[PDB]
Design a protein around this nucleic acid. Structure first.
Ligand SMILES: [Mg+2]
Ligand SMILES: [Mg+2]
Ligand SMILES: [Mg+2]
Ligand SMILES: [Mg+2]
Ligand SMILES: [Mg+2]
Ligand SMILES: [Mg+2]
Ligand SMILES: [Mg+2]
Ligand SMILES: [Mg+2]
Ligand SMILES: [Mg+2]
Ligand SMILES: [Mg+2]
Ligand SMILES: [Mg+2]
Ligand SMILES: [Mg+2]
Ligand SMILES: [Mg+2]
Ligand SMILES: [Mg+2]
Ligand SMILES: [Mg+2]
Ligand SMILES: [Mg+2]
Ligand SMILES: [Mg+2]
Ligand SMILES: [Mg+2]
Ligand SMILES: [Mg+2]
Ligand SMILES: [Mg+2]
Ligand SMILES: [Mg+2]
Ligand SMILES: [Mg+2]
Ligand SMILES: [Mg+2]
Ligand SMILES: [Mg+2]
Ligand SMILES: [Mg+2]
Ligand SMILES: [Mg+2]
Ligand SMILES: [Mg+2]
Ligand SMILES: [Mg+2]
Ligand SMILES: [Mg+2]
Ligand SMILES: [Mg+2]
Ligand SMILES: [Mg+2]
Lengths: 80, 122, 82, 156, 129, 205
RNA sequence: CCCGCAGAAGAAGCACCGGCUAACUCCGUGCCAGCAGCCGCGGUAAUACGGAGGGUGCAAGCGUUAAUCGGAAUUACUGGGCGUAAAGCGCACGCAGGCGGUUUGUUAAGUCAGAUGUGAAAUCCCCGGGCUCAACCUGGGAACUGCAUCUGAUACUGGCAAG
RNA sequence: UAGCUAGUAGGUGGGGUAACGGCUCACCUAGGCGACGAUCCCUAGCUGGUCUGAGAGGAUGACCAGCCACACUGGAACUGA
């Protein structure tokens, strides 16, 4: 079993890289409201097969570049 | 009012403004007497109040009260000042501490001796 | 490397030692890995005064931990008492 | 057996043609010390006449409160013009912790152990109005059971 | 527009009680019928019915004692602008237990007392005293 | 650390007998008990609620001989403990060694009992205890040591005690000059003209 | 730490007393000297200035100054307001953003329950032990209101599909 | 304080470290961060904790313990686990 995250592809232009947003809900520490927060991750893909809008499952791996420490596991709903 | 609003611009407490800036969080400060004079009080009351101008070790120059009946102070006297307004005397925000370096105690006092630097009478 | 030794707490003239296993480089009263007993040298009568978890004492020695002369004395004393 | 406490005396003025006419106003509160507390105002030209007119009014206009072993049934909030009041049933031994106006009302009422606090205007006449109103709008397990159409335990 | 229909129900109750109305009627819904059910079963209203199929209208017959409303206060807590969830050990009790809080749990909507005794917290829909 | 001032003045201020003298006489034949101390004594003040709360706490302190710092610490400890803070406060006061020795005969007053204690004349469980405020516990035996047992003050004190009311929660053997602290006193056991709720209120404001 | 000896023998000060706030009289000065945290007090009868007597509060300490929190619900999430006291933009359209009528299916994201790991020791708290007591030291507990993982619940919010 | 950024973002290959990595280099792609506050200015060691507060919070980081940084100021490397 491998820990994994799910998010959406906000940019796929880079060669073999993509940026994914793993937006999440979090209770506000003071005011109790549940707020959306987003975390952008540079993720590694081979073949640059992930298109923008795709929902993708990613995993954490060794450093692959100055800013990439996550890799793609698989695409969910590749329709866009 | 709305939570959303507070989440965008949190409540922001006002910073308390001090009443004794020349002391800069020091209980007492030392300073030299530049001039010693008397000033008229505010309109409701009436008297000749003893004050001094004081240059502090930190550069600040302030006016300070010289409480008590009688004082032997002149220019180039090094005194100690403490916090404390006089209200009916605008500008004077510090109180000279009797008993300090070149502040003599008030003569012939029996009550409140410790507030005026007066030794215990034999 | 890892050693089992006493850390002197308590107050002036009333020493109280806590036997702890720790990296020998850390300060006497500083970072330790696990506490495993105590030793009161000034406890009155009827008070146990010295209680040592001898099973963890074993685990750690089995893993190459050394033993102070004084904890070695404590361990031999407790083994003699019972 | 009724207990009476003078809460506040005040000097008012009427400034008639000739100048000022001074009079006094004594706000008092009587009570038996067992779920029964009557507060009363008293305006009179003299202070003794005022304390007495006020006692007299307070002695009538008295109400009952559903106490619970010297403490309240449940937390209660009170409201009137400027004065918001809040009272909570404390455990036994604490005593009465409250502002002066409330201290006097709760004391004469018989509330032995309560935590209270007044918010907004502490004007005594309105604090007393709001504490009285708070205690009066306070129901009891049996009365609430009757209202709700069940028994006591069925509330617990 | 209309964005909290549960608050709307609470308000229709409070306002009809204050206006000594014998009954009140509102557009129905499963969640409303479930709250009316808990309210009725706990004795804050007489009864309720739903009438119609395409636009089901729920009707609550209110309850009075001494020409007074049985429901002294009734307020929405968790609301669309601030959802309130509590754990089992944090469950409030209103009026020190004399009233009730309606809680929605993994096993449906029930009172605070019930959910406490059953060991499951949830979303605090409203308070009633 | 000890009040060395005149006693009957405190009693006059408190308008009541505080048991600060031996009891050989009638206190009203020893001072103008009702009259307040000082020149402005004949007139009574219209005393605010804060005044009555303060004067009541002062009354209790002056009875037992405890100064403010220590009395405040007693309050904090009574409050922390379970149960009524006021009753726990009076239990704590009544558990002091000086108090127990005074309610156990040996001393005409608490001042004498304190001097006996301080001067290494009292043992609890056969050990010399020399601090007045030592808290004695249920099932204790306090005794006068042999060398102090022949002091004539103590004999007189037990006689006067024989003329005073005998406290319930202590079992005293006067012959042996030996006594037992069977149990902590309840509130109903202790005088009913000491009030507590004022003291608890005074320390919350 | 214990024991022996002399002898009350070597050991009490500080602040305040108009209201807030517990505690008042006289004499001195006379809008001067002076006091003051605020309101204030003093112009010949001062409980407010100075002294005395008396009293109050603390006590080997007591006051003054500086700083933080509280009281201050006086930045209000708990827990405020906006007709006139400060406060609704001059009005409208509208992208982000916030919120969403009703029914069914599904999802386990939020949510809840349980378990596992972790949340250093010390500190706070509870029950005990040791110093003549306390301070102090110490034994054992909970608590660290959190995070992560795993297994469960379908009420509510969210997603997807059909209405 | 509204834009900031050319080793900057990524890829291929070479070198280098105990180790992954623009860590470095040559080439290619022209990116990457930013209203959920990037860049810039002022201030500041961080935490267990301390004080206060009913609580939520507010202020704070002396002593004890854990971590970081520094050793006249600015750089560099050697020996060595
Ligand atoms: Mg106000
Ligand atoms: Mg002391
Ligand atoms: Mg007075
Ligand atoms: Mg004065
Ligand atoms: Mg005269
Ligand atoms: Mg005169
Ligand atoms: Mg004064
Ligand atoms: Mg005077
Ligand atoms: Mg201060
Ligand atoms: Mg606040
Ligand atoms: Mg306001
Ligand atoms: Mg206007
Ligand atoms: Mg206006
Ligand atoms: Mg308008
Ligand atoms: Mg909906
Ligand atoms: Mg939506
Ligand atoms: Mg889930
Ligand atoms: Mg002990
Ligand atoms: Mg401990
Ligand atoms: Mg811990
Ligand atoms: Mg749904
Ligand atoms: Mg490479
Ligand atoms: Mg290579
Ligand atoms: Mg790196
Ligand atoms: Mg710095
Ligand atoms: Mg620094
Ligand atoms: Mg508060
Ligand atoms: Mg330091
Ligand atoms: Mg260097
Ligand atoms: Mg140097
Ligand atoms: Mg080398």
């Amino acid at each position: 079993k491998i820990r994994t995250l799910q998010g959406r592809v906000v940019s796929d232009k880079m060669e073999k890289s993509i940026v994914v947003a793993i937006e999440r809900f979090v209770k506000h520490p003071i005011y109790g409201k549940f707020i959306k927060r987003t975390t952008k991750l540079h993720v590694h893909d081979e073949n640059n097969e992930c298109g923008i809008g795709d929902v993708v499952e990613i995993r954490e791996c060794r450093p692959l570049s100055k800013t990439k420490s996550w890799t793609l596991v698989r695409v969910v709903e590749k329709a866009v | 009012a709305t939570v959303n609003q507070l989440v965008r611009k949190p409540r922001a407490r006002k910073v308390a403004k001090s009443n004794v800036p020349a002391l800069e969080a020091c209980p007492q400060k030392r300073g030299v007497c530049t001039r010693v004079y008397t000033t008229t009080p505010k309109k409701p009351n009436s008297a000749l109040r003893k004050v001094c101008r004081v240059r502090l070790t930190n550069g600040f120059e302030v006016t300070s009260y010289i409480g008590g009946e009688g004082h032997n102070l002149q220019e180039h006297s090094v005194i100690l000042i403490r916090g404390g307004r006089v209200k009916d005397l605008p500008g004077v925000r510090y109180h000279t501490v009797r008993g300090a370096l070149d502040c003599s105690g008030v003569k012939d006092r029996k009550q409140a001796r410790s507030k005026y630097g007066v030794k215990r009478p034999k | 490397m890892v050693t089992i030794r006493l850390a002197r707490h308590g107050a002036k003239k009333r020493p109280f030692y806590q036997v702890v296993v720790a990296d020998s480089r850390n300060a006497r009263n500083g970072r330790f890995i696990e506490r495993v007993g105590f030793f009161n040298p000034i406890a009155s009568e009827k008070e146990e005064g010295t209680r040592l978890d001898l099973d963890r004492i074993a685990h750690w020695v089995g893993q190459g931990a050394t033993i102070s002369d004084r904890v070695a004395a404590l361990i031999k004393e407790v083994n003699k008492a019972a | 057996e009724l207990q009476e406490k003078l809460i506040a005396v005040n000097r008012v003025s009427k400034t008639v043609k000739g100048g000022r006419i001074f009079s006094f106003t004594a706000l008092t509160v009587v009570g038996d010390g067992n779920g029964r507390v009557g507060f009363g105002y008293g305006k009179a030209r003299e202070v003794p006449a005022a304390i007495q007119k006020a006692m007299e009014k307070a002695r009538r206009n008295m109400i009952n409160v559903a106490l619970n072993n010297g403490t309240l049934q449940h937390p209660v909030k009170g409201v009137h013009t400027g004065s918001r009041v809040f009272m909570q049933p404390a455990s036994e031994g604490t005593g009465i912790i409250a502002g002066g106006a409330m201290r006097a009302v709760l004391e004469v009422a018989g509330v032995h152990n309560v935590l209270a606090k007044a918010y907004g205007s502490t004007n005594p006449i309105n604090v007393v109005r709001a504490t009285i109103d708070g205690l009066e709008n306070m129901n009891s397990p049996e009365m609430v059971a009757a209202k709700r159409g069940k028994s006591v335990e069925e509330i617990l | 527009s209309m964005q909290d229909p549960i608050a709307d129900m609470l308000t229709r109750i409070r306002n009809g009680q204050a206006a000594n109305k014998a009954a009140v009627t509102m557009p129905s819904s499963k969640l409303k019928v479930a709250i009316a059910n808990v309210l009725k079963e706990e004795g804050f209203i007489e009864d309720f019915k739903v009438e119609g199929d395409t636009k089901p209208e729920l009707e609550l017959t209110l309850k009075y004692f001494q020409g007074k409303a049985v429901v002294e206060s009734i307020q929405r807590v968790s609301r669309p602008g601030l959802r309130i969830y509590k754990r089992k050990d944090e469950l409030p009790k209103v009026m020190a237990g004399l009233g009730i809080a309606v809680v929605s749990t993994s096993k449906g909507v029930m009172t605070d007392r019930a959910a406490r005794q059953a060991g499951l917290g949830g979303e605090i829909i409203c308070y009633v005293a | 650390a000890r009040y060395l001032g005149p006693k009957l003045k405190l009693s006059r201020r408190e308008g009541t007998d505080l048991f600060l003298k031996s009891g050989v006489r009638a206190i009203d034949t020893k001072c103008k008990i009702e009259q307040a101390p000082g020149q402005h004594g004949a007139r009574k003040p219209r005393l605010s609620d804060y005044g009555v709360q303060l004067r009541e706490k002062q009354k209790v302190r002056r009875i037992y001989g405890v100064l403010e710092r220590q009395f405040r610490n007693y309050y904090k400890e009574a409050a922390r403990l379970k149960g009524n803070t006021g009753e726990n406060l009076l239990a704590l006061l009544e558990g002091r060694l000086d108090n127990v020795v005074y309610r156990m005969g040996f001393g005409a007053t608490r001042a004498e009992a304190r001097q006996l204690v301080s001067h290494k004349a009292i043992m609890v469980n056969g050990r010399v205890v020399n601090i007045a405020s030592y808290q004695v516990s249920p099932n204790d035996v306090v005794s006068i040591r042999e060398k102090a047992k022949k002091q004539s003050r103590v004999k007189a004190a037990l006689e006067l005690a024989e003329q005073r009311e005998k406290p319930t929660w202590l079992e005293v053997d006067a012959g042996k000059m030996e006594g037992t602290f069977k149990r902590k006193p309840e509130r109903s056991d202790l005088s009913a003209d000491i009030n507590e709720h004022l003291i608890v209120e005074l320390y919350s404001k």
